[PDB]
Amino acid sequence: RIKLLLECTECKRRNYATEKNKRNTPNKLELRKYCPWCRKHTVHREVKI
C-alpha cells in the first residue's frame, strides 16, 4: 500500500513474465523491456497492472 505497490510484466499478448516493482518516483511510467518465452526472447514490453 505504501509508495510500494506490486505490478508485473506481460508482453504484446504473446506471454507475461512477472516481478513486483514499486510506485514512488516516476509512478506509472511503465514500458520497460524483459523478453517472454514468446518466440526467442522478444520485446515483451512489461506494463501490465
Question: How many residues line the site for RNA (CB under 7 A)?
Answer: 15
CB of 32 to RNA, least distance (A): 6
**Measured between alpha carbons, how far is 22 from 12 in angstroms, rounded to an integer?**
22
Q: Which of residues 1-49 bind RNA (CB under 7 A)?
A: 10, 16-19, 21-22, 32-35, 37, 40-41, 44
Q: Which residues of the chain form contacts with RNA (CB under 7 A)?
A: 10, 16-19, 21-22, 32-35, 37, 40-41, 44
